Structures are given as structure tokens and as C-alpha cells.
Amino acid sequence: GAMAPSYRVKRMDIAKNDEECVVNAANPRGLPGDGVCKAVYKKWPESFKNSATPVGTAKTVMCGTYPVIHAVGPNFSNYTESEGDRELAAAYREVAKEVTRLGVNSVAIPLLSTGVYSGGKDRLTQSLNHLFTAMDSTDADVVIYCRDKEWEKKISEAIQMRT
Ligand SMILES: [Cl-]
Ligand SMILES: [Cl-]
Ligand SMILES: [Cl-]
């Protein structure tokens, strides 16, 4: 575990992370996709061998020795708000099980279901609060990746407000 487990946020491409493993915002079919998924496919294409997995689950595939945790959040265009909320919480719980199983001291993580799976809504708080619910009982250092300057500020505020 980390000596003093922490949360941090950085505004940059998760493909350039400085952590011991990465969480992909995957689709259920293991396809290259869009957004974070496409960046992950460019950097770690070997990790897409047999990565298909259902909504609400995570599946780890190694790229060399570097673990890629493919986490499938719901697409809110298809799910009801209630069922999508349940599956988004479930995907993060499965990320926490994998991070623990792998024994890593740090993990790079995007906010699941916030981009093209957001159903056109701002889901920063919903997705971040499910991340915290799952990861709070882990001892890995967690580094959240985002691309928007205003999101960086709001994620940073949410972290700092709990310390
Ligand atoms: Cl960048
Ligand atoms: Cl998304
Ligand atoms: Cl963002």
C-alpha cells in the first residue's frame, strides 16, 4: 500500500500517467472506442486481447507487466437514471477489487460515464462520489485524470474538502 494513501487530480492525457496501473473507460465489446478509450488503445493496444466484459464490471489485461483495468460504465443514453446509477457504482466497486488484487501502490483513473456515455448531462459529482465510495477502503494512491480546466478545479475542491 501507499505510506499515506492520497487522492490527486491532474489535467492531462491518462496515457502519460505516472502510476503503477491504469483504468480504461472501456466499452463492453473491447473495441478501440473514443475519448480516454481511444488514448488507451493507442498506448496499450496489447491490453485489448479478450478485454470485452459486461456493463458494471472490470476486467484486467496486462500490457507487458503494466495492468490495464478495463472498467465498463453504463451509457446513460440507454439506461434509466436509476439503473445507470446502480451500474456506475458497481463498475467502481469492481475497479477497487482489481486494484487490491493487483497489489499496486498507485492507480490512474478517469471519471466513468462523464463523456460520450453521459447522456448529455454533467455527471462530475455523481461519478466522483461513486469513485470515492469504492476507493476509500483501498490503500493505493489514486490520481484522477480529466481534460477540462473547470472540472479540474471542481475535482480538486471535492478532494480538499474531505481532508
Ligand atoms: Cl497531455
Ligand atoms: Cl464516457
Ligand atoms: Cl474532463
PDB file of all heavy atoms in Angstrom, residues 28-42:
ATOM      1  N   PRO A  28     -18.228  -2.234 -23.621  1.00  0.00           N
ATOM      2  CA  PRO A  28     -18.384  -3.635 -23.288  1.00  0.00           C
ATOM      3  C   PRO A  28     -17.790  -4.639 -24.276  1.00  0.00           C
ATOM      4  O   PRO A  28     -17.619  -5.801 -23.971  1.00  0.00           O
ATOM      5  CB  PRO A  28     -19.910  -3.826 -23.210  1.00  0.00           C
ATOM      6  CG  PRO A  28     -20.510  -2.501 -23.301  1.00  0.00           C
ATOM      7  CD  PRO A  28     -19.512  -1.506 -23.772  1.00  0.00           C
ATOM      8  N   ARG A  29     -17.447  -4.154 -25.464  1.00  0.00           N
ATOM      9  CA  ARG A  29     -17.058  -5.041 -26.588  1.00  0.00           C
ATOM     10  C   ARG A  29     -15.559  -5.092 -26.760  1.00  0.00           C
ATOM     11  O   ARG A  29     -15.075  -5.816 -27.646  1.00  0.00           O
ATOM     12  CB  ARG A  29     -17.734  -4.562 -27.853  1.00  0.00           C
ATOM     13  CG  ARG A  29     -19.225  -4.754 -27.646  1.00  0.00           C
ATOM     14  CD  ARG A  29     -20.010  -4.508 -28.902  1.00  0.00           C
ATOM     15  NE  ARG A  29     -21.379  -4.530 -28.474  1.00  0.00           N
ATOM     16  CZ  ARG A  29     -22.126  -5.649 -28.445  1.00  0.00           C
ATOM     17  NH1 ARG A  29     -21.711  -6.837 -28.897  1.00  0.00           N
ATOM     18  NH2 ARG A  29     -23.310  -5.565 -27.909  1.00  0.00           N
ATOM     19  N   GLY A  30     -14.786  -4.378 -25.928  1.00  0.00           N
ATOM     20  CA  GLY A  30     -13.342  -4.396 -26.106  1.00  0.00           C
ATOM     21  C   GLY A  30     -12.901  -3.718 -27.380  1.00  0.00           C
ATOM     22  O   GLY A  30     -11.815  -4.042 -27.893  1.00  0.00           O
ATOM     23  N   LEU A  31     -13.649  -2.758 -27.903  1.00  0.00           N
ATOM     24  CA  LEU A  31     -13.282  -2.012 -29.129  1.00  0.00           C
ATOM     25  C   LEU A  31     -12.435  -0.803 -28.793  1.00  0.00           C
ATOM     26  O   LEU A  31     -12.478  -0.265 -27.681  1.00  0.00           O
ATOM     27  CB  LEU A  31     -14.572  -1.594 -29.835  1.00  0.00           C
ATOM     28  CG  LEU A  31     -15.360  -2.735 -30.442  1.00  0.00           C
ATOM     29  CD1 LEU A  31     -16.804  -2.316 -30.655  1.00  0.00           C
ATOM     30  CD2 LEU A  31     -14.777  -3.168 -31.770  1.00  0.00           C
ATOM     31  N   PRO A  32     -11.647  -0.273 -29.748  1.00  0.00           N
ATOM     32  CA  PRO A  32     -10.870   0.947 -29.508  1.00  0.00           C
ATOM     33  C   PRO A  32     -11.664   2.157 -29.038  1.00  0.00           C
ATOM     34  O   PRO A  32     -11.165   2.943 -28.253  1.00  0.00           O
ATOM     35  CB  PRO A  32     -10.193   1.257 -30.842  1.00  0.00           C
ATOM     36  CG  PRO A  32     -10.092  -0.113 -31.424  1.00  0.00           C
ATOM     37  CD  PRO A  32     -11.403  -0.818 -31.090  1.00  0.00           C
ATOM     38  N   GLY A  33     -12.895   2.331 -29.469  1.00  0.00           N
ATOM     39  CA  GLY A  33     -13.748   3.391 -28.897  1.00  0.00           C
ATOM     40  C   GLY A  33     -13.335   4.811 -29.235  1.00  0.00           C
ATOM     41  O   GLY A  33     -12.700   4.993 -30.297  1.00  0.00           O
ATOM     42  N   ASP A  34     -13.612   5.742 -28.312  1.00  0.00           N
ATOM     43  CA  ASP A  34     -13.456   7.219 -28.404  1.00  0.00           C
ATOM     44  C   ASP A  34     -12.954   7.765 -27.065  1.00  0.00           C
ATOM     45  O   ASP A  34     -12.971   7.013 -26.051  1.00  0.00           O
ATOM     46  CB  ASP A  34     -14.801   7.867 -28.762  1.00  0.00           C
ATOM     47  CG  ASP A  34     -15.360   7.344 -30.074  1.00  0.00           C
ATOM     48  OD1 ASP A  34     -14.736   7.637 -31.131  1.00  0.00           O
ATOM     49  OD2 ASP A  34     -16.392   6.606 -30.030  1.00  0.00           O
ATOM     50  N   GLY A  35     -12.478   9.005 -27.015  1.00  0.00           N
ATOM     51  CA  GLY A  35     -12.071   9.659 -25.756  1.00  0.00           C
ATOM     52  C   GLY A  35     -10.914   8.930 -25.082  1.00  0.00           C
ATOM     53  O   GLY A  35      -9.961   8.512 -25.765  1.00  0.00           O
ATOM     54  N   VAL A  36     -11.009   8.743 -23.762  1.00  0.00           N
ATOM     55  CA  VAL A  36      -9.986   8.002 -22.981  1.00  0.00           C
ATOM     56  C   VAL A  36      -9.743   6.619 -23.597  1.00  0.00           C
ATOM     57  O   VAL A  36      -8.559   6.190 -23.676  1.00  0.00           O
ATOM     58  CB  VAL A  36     -10.394   7.897 -21.508  1.00  0.00           C
ATOM     59  CG1 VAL A  36      -9.687   6.781 -20.761  1.00  0.00           C
ATOM     60  CG2 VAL A  36     -10.243   9.244 -20.822  1.00  0.00           C
ATOM     61  N   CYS A  37     -10.793   5.882 -23.978  1.00  0.00           N
ATOM     62  CA  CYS A  37     -10.650   4.509 -24.517  1.00  0.00           C
ATOM     63  C   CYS A  37      -9.706   4.550 -25.724  1.00  0.00           C
ATOM     64  O   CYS A  37      -8.862   3.635 -25.884  1.00  0.00           O
ATOM     65  CB  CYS A  37     -12.041   3.914 -24.785  1.00  0.00           C
ATOM     66  SG  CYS A  37     -11.982   2.153 -25.138  1.00  0.00           S
ATOM     67  N   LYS A  38      -9.892   5.554 -26.599  1.00  0.00           N
ATOM     68  CA  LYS A  38      -9.025   5.605 -27.810  1.00  0.00           C
ATOM     69  C   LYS A  38      -7.557   5.919 -27.436  1.00  0.00           C
ATOM     70  O   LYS A  38      -6.623   5.312 -28.030  1.00  0.00           O
ATOM     71  CB  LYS A  38      -9.617   6.593 -28.811  1.00  0.00           C
ATOM     72  CG  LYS A  38      -8.755   6.888 -30.036  1.00  0.00           C
ATOM     73  CD  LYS A  38      -8.285   5.658 -30.781  1.00  0.00           C
ATOM     74  CE  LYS A  38      -9.424   4.801 -31.294  1.00  0.00           C
ATOM     75  NZ  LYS A  38      -8.992   4.043 -32.490  1.00  0.00           N
ATOM     76  N   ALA A  39      -7.354   6.788 -26.466  1.00  0.00           N
ATOM     77  CA  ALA A  39      -5.978   7.082 -25.997  1.00  0.00           C
ATOM     78  C   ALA A  39      -5.297   5.822 -25.423  1.00  0.00           C
ATOM     79  O   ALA A  39      -4.093   5.527 -25.663  1.00  0.00           O
ATOM     80  CB  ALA A  39      -6.050   8.158 -24.978  1.00  0.00           C
ATOM     81  N   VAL A  40      -6.045   5.083 -24.623  1.00  0.00           N
ATOM     82  CA  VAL A  40      -5.605   3.816 -24.006  1.00  0.00           C
ATOM     83  C   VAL A  40      -5.258   2.815 -25.111  1.00  0.00           C
ATOM     84  O   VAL A  40      -4.285   2.085 -25.027  1.00  0.00           O
ATOM     85  CB  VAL A  40      -6.639   3.324 -22.978  1.00  0.00           C
ATOM     86  CG1 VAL A  40      -6.374   1.909 -22.511  1.00  0.00           C
ATOM     87  CG2 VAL A  40      -6.787   4.270 -21.780  1.00  0.00           C
ATOM     88  N   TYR A  41      -6.093   2.736 -26.168  1.00  0.00           N
ATOM     89  CA  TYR A  41      -5.838   1.776 -27.256  1.00  0.00           C
ATOM     90  C   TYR A  41      -4.531   2.108 -27.993  1.00  0.00           C
ATOM     91  O   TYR A  41      -3.796   1.174 -28.353  1.00  0.00           O
ATOM     92  CB  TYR A  41      -7.028   1.737 -28.235  1.00  0.00           C
ATOM     93  CG  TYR A  41      -6.834   0.718 -29.336  1.00  0.00           C
ATOM     94  CD1 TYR A  41      -6.973  -0.633 -29.101  1.00  0.00           C
ATOM     95  CD2 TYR A  41      -6.408   1.111 -30.598  1.00  0.00           C
ATOM     96  CE1 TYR A  41      -6.734  -1.581 -30.092  1.00  0.00           C
ATOM     97  CE2 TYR A  41      -6.211   0.184 -31.610  1.00  0.00           C
ATOM     98  CZ  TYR A  41      -6.341  -1.152 -31.344  1.00  0.00           C
ATOM     99  OH  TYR A  41      -6.157  -2.081 -32.327  1.00  0.00           O
ATOM    100  N   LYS A  42      -4.261   3.400 -28.197  1.00  0.00           N
ATOM    101  CA  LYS A  42      -3.005   3.849 -28.858  1.00  0.00           C
ATOM    102  C   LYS A  42      -1.797   3.419 -28.001  1.00  0.00           C
ATOM    103  O   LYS A  42      -0.792   2.847 -28.541  1.00  0.00           O
ATOM    104  CB  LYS A  42      -3.063   5.360 -29.101  1.00  0.00           C
ATOM    105  CG  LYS A  42      -3.998   5.796 -30.228  1.00  0.00           C
ATOM    106  CD  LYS A  42      -4.282   7.285 -30.289  1.00  0.00           C
ATOM    107  CE  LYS A  42      -5.170   7.654 -31.465  1.00  0.00           C
ATOM    108  NZ  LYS A  42      -5.832   8.966 -31.275  1.00  0.00           N
TER     109      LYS A  42
END
